[PDB]
Ligand binder design. Structure first.
Ligand SMILES: Cc1cc2nc3c(=O)[nH]c(=O)nc-3n(C[C@H](O)[C@H](O)[C@H](O)COP(=O)(O)OP(=O)(O)OC[C@H]3O[C@@H](n4cnc5c(N)ncnc54)[C@H](O)[C@@H]3O)c2cc1C
Ligand SMILES: [Cl-]
Length: 487
C-alpha cells in the first residue's frame, strides 16, 4: 500500500500544491508534516514573523481537520526525524515543494539520501516561483539575465507560467491511528509563548492561506485599480489602507500561490487592453521576485559582499553608533524614525519607505554596509526573503543592479510630497502628534515656544538629527564616486 508524507516548509497552502496532490494519489495514509527546531530561538527572529508562521500552521491545521486529516508538527531536525518516521509509518513516497535557497539545497540533499536508504520515492515539484528557474537559465544560454529588461524578454519567449494546480480532494487519507510519533500532544501547533517569546506580536497582518486568499480577492475587487497599477506612483505614507497589495508575507511563506496570482492578473489584463506593462505593473512586481530568485539562486555568496561576483566591493564604514541610531529609530529625522518604527511594530513597510531608510543608512547619509541594515530587516520583516532582501539592499546601496548613486533621497522632503500634514509620522511617532505640520519633518527648526507647547523638546523628548543631510550626502556621493571609478 502507499503511505506518503507531504512535507511543508514553504508552500503553506492547499491550493496550487502539486506536491500535496501527488502525495494523496492512490494513498492509503497521508502524513502532513512540518518540522520545527525547538531550539531555533536559542541561537534574530522577531515574534511578529514567527507568530505569522504559527498562524499559518494553525490555518493549515483547520483546513486538514475539515478534510478528515491532521497537521503533524514534528519537533527536531529533519535529518533525524525522517529516518524514524519512514520506518514507523511505512512511508513509500515523500513529497515537498522545491526550494532554491542555500540552506534548503544542503538540507534537501541529505533527506533525499536518507529517503533512498529507506526505499522512499521523492517527488519535488516547483510551485514556489512562477517558472522552473533552472529552465530559465538554460534557455538563456546557461547564464541568468542580469537586467530586468533582458529577463522580461526571456520570460516572454518562454511563455505563460504553468496554470495553478487543481484543488485537493474534499476528503484526504488520514494518518494511521496509534502511531507514537503522531501523538497529538507531541505534534500540535505551539503558541508564541510556548516557543520562548516574552513580548506579544504587534503586527496587524494575520498569517495563513485563508487570510491570503481573502486579501487577494480584496485587491481584485476593483479591476481598474489592478489594470492601471504602476508601482513607482504609489503612496508610501498610506497606512490605514496601504497603497499596494501587502501580499509579500503570504507569498514568502507560500500561503498564496504566485501562479494563482499571475493567472488572476491575466484574466484582468484580457479585459483591459490599456493595462500597465512590466516592470511597473502588478505582473512586473511578480517578475521582480522571479528575477531576483533566478539571479540569486545561481550566484555564489549572494547575501554577502565578499566573494559575490555581482556585488561591488565598497569600503563601508564600521560605525556602530550610526547603525544603532538607525536600528533604534532615533536618527532625529521623523520620516526615517517613523518607518523604522513601522518595521518593528508591523514588520512591513511600503517599497518606497524601504527605499528611504535603506538609502539613508548606506550610500545616502551614514555609509554603513548594506549587510548590516539587511540583518536588521531579516529580524523584523514578516516578509523577509533571502533573495529579495539581498538583491534590494544591493540595489539601494548601488552595489549591484543599480549604479546611479547621484540620486539620493532626502529624509526631509521625500515624505512631505505625499503627506504634508505628517499623518504617517504622528501615527508611529505619537511624541510628535501635536507638532505643527510646518516643523513635523524638521522638528529641530521649530522655535522653543512651539516645541514646549507641543510637548516635544528636541534633545529631551525627541533626539536631534544625528547628521546634517546636506553635509552627509555630499560626502557619501563623492566617496561612492571614488569607489566606482577605482573598480
Ligand atoms: C531594502 C529592501 C528590502 C526588501 N526586502 C524584501 C523582502 O525581504 N521580502 C520581500 O518580499 N520584498 C522585499 N523587498 C521588496 C518590496 O519592497 C516588497 O516586496 C514590497 O514592499 C511588498 O509589498 P506588496 O506585497 O504590497 O507589493 P506589491 O507592489 O503589491 O507587489 C506584489 C508582490 O510582488 C513582489 N515584489 C514587489 N516589489 C518587489 C521587489 N522590489 N522585489 C521583489 N519582489 C517584489 C512581492 O512578492 C509582492 O508581494 C525589499 C525592498 C527593499 C527596497
Ligand atoms: Cl527626494
Amino acid at each position: 500500500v502507499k503511505n506518503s508524507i507531504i512535507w511543508f516548509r514553504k508552500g503553506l497552502r492547499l491550493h496550487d500544491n502539486p506536491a500535496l496532490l501527488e502525495a494523496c494519489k492512490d494513498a492509503k495514509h497521508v502524513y502532513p508534516v512540518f518540522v520545527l527546531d525547538p531550539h531555533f530561538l536559542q541561537q534574530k527572529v522577531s515574534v511578529n514573523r514567527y507568530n505569522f508562521l504559527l498562524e499559518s500552521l494553525e490555518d493549515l491545521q483547520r483546513s486538514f481537520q475539515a478534510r478528515g486529516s491532521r497537521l503533524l508538527v514534528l519537533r527536531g531536525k529533519p535529518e533525524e526525524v525522517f529516518p524514524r518516521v519512514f520506518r514507523e509509518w511505512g512511508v513509500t513516497q515523500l513529497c515537498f515543494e522545491h526550494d532554491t535557497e542555500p540552506y534548503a539545497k544542503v538540507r534537501d540533499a541529505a533527506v533525499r539520501r536518507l529517503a533512498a536508504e529507506a526505499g522512499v520515492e521523492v517527488v519535488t515539484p516547483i510551485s514556489h516561483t512562477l517558472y522552473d528557474t533552472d529552465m530559465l537559465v538554460a534557455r538563456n544560454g546557461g547564464a541568468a539575465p542580469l537586467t530586468m529588461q533582458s529577463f522580461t524578454k526571456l520570460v516572454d519567449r518562454v511563455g505563460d507560467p504553468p496554470a495553478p494546480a487543481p484543488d485537493p480532494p474534499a476528503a484526504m487519507p488520514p494518518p494511521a491511528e496509534d502511531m507514537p510519533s503522531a501523538a497529538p500532544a507531541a505534534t500540535g501547533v505551539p503558541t508564541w509563548q510556548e516557543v520562548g517569546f516574552k513580548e506579544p506580536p504587534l503586527t496587524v497582518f494575520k498569517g495563513g492561506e485563508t487570510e491570503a486568499l481573502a486579501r487577494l480577492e480584496a485587491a481584485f475587487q476593483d479591476p481598474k485599480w489592478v489594470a492601471g497599477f504602476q508601482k513607482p506612483d504609489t503612496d508610501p505614507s498610506a497606512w490605514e489602507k496601504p497603497a499596494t497589495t501587502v501580499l509579500s508575507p503570504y507569498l514568502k511563506f507560500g500561503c498564496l500561490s504566485a501562479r494563482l496570482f499571475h493567472a488572476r492578473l491575466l484574466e484582468v489584463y484580457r479585459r483591459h487592453p490599456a493595462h500597465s506593462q512590466p516592470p511597473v505593473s502588478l505582473r512586473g512586481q511578480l517578475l521582480w521576485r522571479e528575477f531576483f530568485y533566478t539571479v540569486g539562486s545561481t550566484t555564489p555568496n549572494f547575501h554577502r559582499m565578499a566573494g559575490n561576483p555581482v556585488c561591488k566591493q565598497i569600503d563601508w564604514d564600521d560605525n556602530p553608533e550610526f547603525l544603532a541610531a538607525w536600528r533604534e529609530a532615533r536618527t532625529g529625522f521623523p520620516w526615517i524614525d517613523a518607518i523604522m518604527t513601522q518595521l518593528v511594530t508591523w514588520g512591513w513597510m511600503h517599497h518606497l519607505a524601504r527605499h528611504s531608510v535603506a538609502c539613508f543608512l548606506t550610500r545616502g547619509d551614514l555609509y554603513v554596509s548594506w549587510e548590516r541594515g539587511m540583518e536588521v530587516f531579516e529580524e523584523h520583516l514578516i516578509d523577509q526573503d533571502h533573495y529579495l532582501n539581498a538583491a534590494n539592499w544591493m540595489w539601494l546601496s548601488a552595489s549591484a543592479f543599480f549604479s546611479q548613486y547621484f540620486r539620493v533621497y532626502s529624509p526631509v522632503v521625500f515624505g512631505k510630497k505625499y503627506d504634508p500634514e505628517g499623518r504617517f509620522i504622528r501615527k508611529f511617532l505619537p511624541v510628535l502628534k501635536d507638532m505643527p505640520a510646518k516643523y513635523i519633518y524638521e522638528p529641530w527648526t521649530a522655535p522653543l515656544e512651539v516645541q514646549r507647547k507641543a510637548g516635544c523638546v528636541v534633545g529631551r523628548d525627541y533626539p536631534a538629527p544625528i547628521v546634517d543631510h546636506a553635509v552627509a550626502s555630499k560626502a557619501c556621493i563623492a566617496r561612492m564616486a571614488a569607489a566606482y571609478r577605482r573598480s
